[PDB]
Amino acid sequence: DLIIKGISVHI
Amino acid sequence: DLIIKGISVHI
Amino acid sequence: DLIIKGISVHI
Amino acid sequence: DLIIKGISVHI
Amino acid sequence: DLIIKGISVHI
Amino acid sequence: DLIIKGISVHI
Amino acid sequence: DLIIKGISVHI
Amino acid sequence: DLIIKGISVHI
Amino acid sequence: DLIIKGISVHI
Amino acid sequence: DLIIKGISVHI
Numbered sequence: 001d002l003i004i005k006g007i008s009v010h011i
Numbered sequence: 012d013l014i015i016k017g018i019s020v021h022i
Numbered sequence: 023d024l025i026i027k028g029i030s031v032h033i
Numbered sequence: 034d035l036i037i038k039g040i041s042v043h044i
Numbered sequence: 045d046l047i048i049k050g051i052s053v054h055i
Numbered sequence: 056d057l058i059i060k061g062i063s064v065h066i
Numbered sequence: 067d068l069i070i071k072g073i074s075v076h077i
Numbered sequence: 078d079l080i081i082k083g084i085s086v087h088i
Numbered sequence: 089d090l091i092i093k094g095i096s097v098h099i
Numbered sequence: 100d101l102i103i104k105g106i107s108v109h110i
Contacts, residue, residue, distance in 0.1 A: 001012045001014070001034045001035070001036075002012070002013045002014065002015075002035045003012075003014045003034070003035065003036045003037070004014070004015045004016065004017075004035075004037045004038075005015075005016045005017075005037065005038045005039070005068055005079050005090075006016070006017045006018070006037075006038075006039045006040070007017070007018045007019075007020075007039070007040045007041070007068060007070060007079060007081055008018070008019045008020070008040075008041045008042075009019075009020045009021075009040075009041070009042045009043070009070065009072055009081060009083055010020070010021045010022070010042075010043045010044075011021075011022045011043070011044045011072060011074050011083060011085045011096075012023045012025070013023070013024045013025065013026075014023075014025045015025070015026045015027065015028075016026075016027045016028075016057055016068050016079075017027070017028045017029070018028070018029045018030075018031075018057060018059060018068060018070055019029070019030045019031070020030075020031045020032075020059065020061055020070060020072055021031070021032045021033070022032075022033045022061060022063050022072060022074045022085075027057050027068075029057060029059055031059060031061055033061060033063045033074075034045045034046070034047075035046045036045070036046065036047045036048070037046075037048045037049075038048065038049045038050070038079055038090050038101075039048075039049075039050045039051070040050070040051045040052070040079060040081060040090060040092055041051075041052045041053075042051075042052070042053045042054070042081065042083055042092060042094055043053075043054045043055075044054070044055045044083060044085050044094060044096045044107075049090055049101050051090060051092060051101060051103055053092065053094055053103060053105055055094060055096050055105060055107045056067045056068070056069075057068045058067070058068065058069045058070070059068075059070045059071075060070065060071045060072070061070075061071075061072045061073070062072070062073045062074070063073075063074045063075075064073075064074070064075045064076070065075075065076045065077075066076070066077045067078045067079070067080075068079045069078070069079065069080045069081070070079075070081045070082075071081065071082045071083070072081075072082075072083045072084070073083070073084045073085070074084075074085045074086075075084075075085070075086045075087070076086075076087045076088075077087070077088045078089045078090070078091075079090045080089070080090065080091045080092070081090075081092045081093075082092065082093045082094070083092075083093075083094045083095070084094070084095045084096070085095075085096045085097075086095075086096070086097045086098070087097075087098045087099075088098070088099045089100045089101070089102075090101045091100070091101065091102045091103070092101075092103045092104075093103065093104045093105070094103075094104075094105045094106070095105070095106045095107070096106075096107045096108075097106075097107070097108045097109070098108075098109045098110075099109070099110045
């Protein structure tokens with residue numbers, strides 16, 4: 001099972 | 012099972 | 023099962 | 034099982 | 045089982 | 056489940 | 067589960 | 078589970 | 089579980 | 100479990 005989770009945040 | 016989750020946020 | 027979820031937000 | 038989790042945040 | 049977790053934060 | 060919440064306020 | 071919450075305030 | 082919370086405030 | 093919390097405040 | 104908490108304050 002491939003599970004990927006990615007996030008990028010600029011303030 | 013492929014599960015991908017991705018998010019990009021600029022403020 | 024392929025499950026993809028993607029979001030991009032600019033404010 | 035591949036599980037990846039990645040995050041990048043700039044303030 | 046591959047489990048990766050990575051984070052980068054700049055303030 | 057992707058849940059995003061973002062707000063920007065200038066006074 | 068991805069949960070993101072972000073806020074920017076200028077007075 | 079990815080949970081991110083970020084805030085920037087200028088007065 | 090990735091949990092990130094970040095804050096920047098200028099007065 | 101990755102838990103990060105960061106804060107920067109200028110007065």
